[PDB]
Design an enzyme around this catalytic site. Structure first.
Site, PDB file in Angstrom:
ATOM      1  N   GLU A   1      -8.365   7.742   2.868  1.00 54.72           N
ATOM      2  CA  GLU A   1      -7.892   7.909   1.486  1.00 54.72           C
ATOM      3  C   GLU A   1      -8.747   7.455   0.770  1.00 54.72           C
ATOM      4  OE1 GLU A   1      -5.367   4.314   1.897  1.00 54.72           O
ATOM      5  OE2 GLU A   1      -3.525   5.712   2.399  1.00 54.72           O
TER       6      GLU A   1
ATOM      7  N   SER B   1       1.069  -1.188   0.050  1.00 57.89           N
ATOM      8  CA  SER B   1       0.103  -0.071  -0.086  1.00 57.89           C
ATOM      9  C   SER B   1       0.746   1.293   0.062  1.00 57.89           C
ATOM     10  CB  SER B   1      -1.016   0.056   1.248  1.00 57.89           C
ATOM     11  OG  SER B   1      -0.177   0.059   2.535  1.00 57.89           O
TER      12      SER B   1
HETATM   13 CA    CA Z   1       3.652   0.700   1.790  1.00 51.04          CA
HETATM   14 MN    MN Z   2      -2.311   7.040   3.405  1.00 48.71          MN
END
Ligand code: CA
Ligand code: MN
EC number: 5.3.3.2
Length: 233
Positions: free
Chosen positions: A154, A92
């Site tokens: 996010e 991520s």
């Molecule tokens: Ca990451």
């Molecule tokens: Mn973030």
């Protein structure tokens, strides 16, 4: 004004110098419909004090599967600012505020950022996974807290890769790696729910909403691609 109970609020003693330096990366700030409204630092975007005022940034999560349909589950290093030591998805991170990663057509900017970070975190060379291999699936809007001070908020693009790859992970980024069957991922989450293991909250969301649906179909996930859609989770 932000109340400060003590100077322990500003403590990042568990974080290494590399992760501290990365707090200055310029991220893409967006509204709730994923429209770019500006740039701000990784530090600012991940402070709960700012998130509670509405600060929101573009991000991605990758789910990477080998050809035996095992998913790559990272354990975040103990030196990550957010969720140190937690088990999580395959990669991520965030696209940066620069021409290459701002490009929106076919989500290429996000897919370039994902290649960049698969290389940086897991040591997967570009020769093995390029943006063409990274499939845009859908988007989810989520918020989580890592601790009282730091957290996430996010518009997160969910990306999928199915490829056998080699790894040379950065221990600044990654503490360990598991390749789990679907059954083992379900078990990891059962154990999380008891308290046995720390797992990022979005991994359960992605698994229960998406991965279990997709898993019998990894040879062709194109039916499940959702354009013009942001899941609020
Ligand atoms: Ca990451
Ligand atoms: Mn973030």
């Amino acid at each position: 004004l932000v109340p400060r109970g003590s100077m322990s609020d500003i403590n990042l003693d568990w974080v290494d110098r590399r992760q501290l330096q990365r707090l200055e990366e310029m991220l893409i700030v967006v509204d709730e419909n994923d429209k770019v409204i500006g740039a701000d630092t990784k530090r600012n975007c991940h402070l709960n004090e700012n998130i509670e005022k509405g600060l929101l940034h573009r991000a991605f999560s990758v789910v990477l599967f080998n050809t035996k349909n095992r998913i790559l589950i990272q354990q975040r290093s103990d030196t990550k600012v957010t969720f140190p030591g937690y088990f999580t998805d395959s990669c991520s991170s965030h696209p940066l505020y620069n021409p290459a990663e701002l490009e929106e057509k076919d989500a290429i900017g996000v897919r370039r950022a994902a290649q960049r970070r698969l290389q940086a975190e897991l040591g997967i060379p570009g020769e093995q996974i390029s943006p063409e291999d990274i499939v845009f699936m859908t988007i989810y809007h989520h918020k989580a807290k890592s601790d009282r001070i730091w957290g996430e908020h996010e518009i997160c693009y969910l990306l999928l890769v199915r490829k056998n790859v080699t790894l040379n992970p950065d221990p600044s980024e990654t503490k360990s790696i598991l390749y789990l069957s679907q059954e083992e991922l379900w078990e990891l989450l059962e154990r999380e729910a008891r308290g046995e293991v720390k797992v990022t909250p979005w991994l359960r969301t992605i698994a229960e909403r998406f991965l279990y649906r997709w898993w019998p179909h990894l040879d062709d996930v194109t039916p499940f691609v959702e354009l013009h859609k942001i899941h609020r989770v």
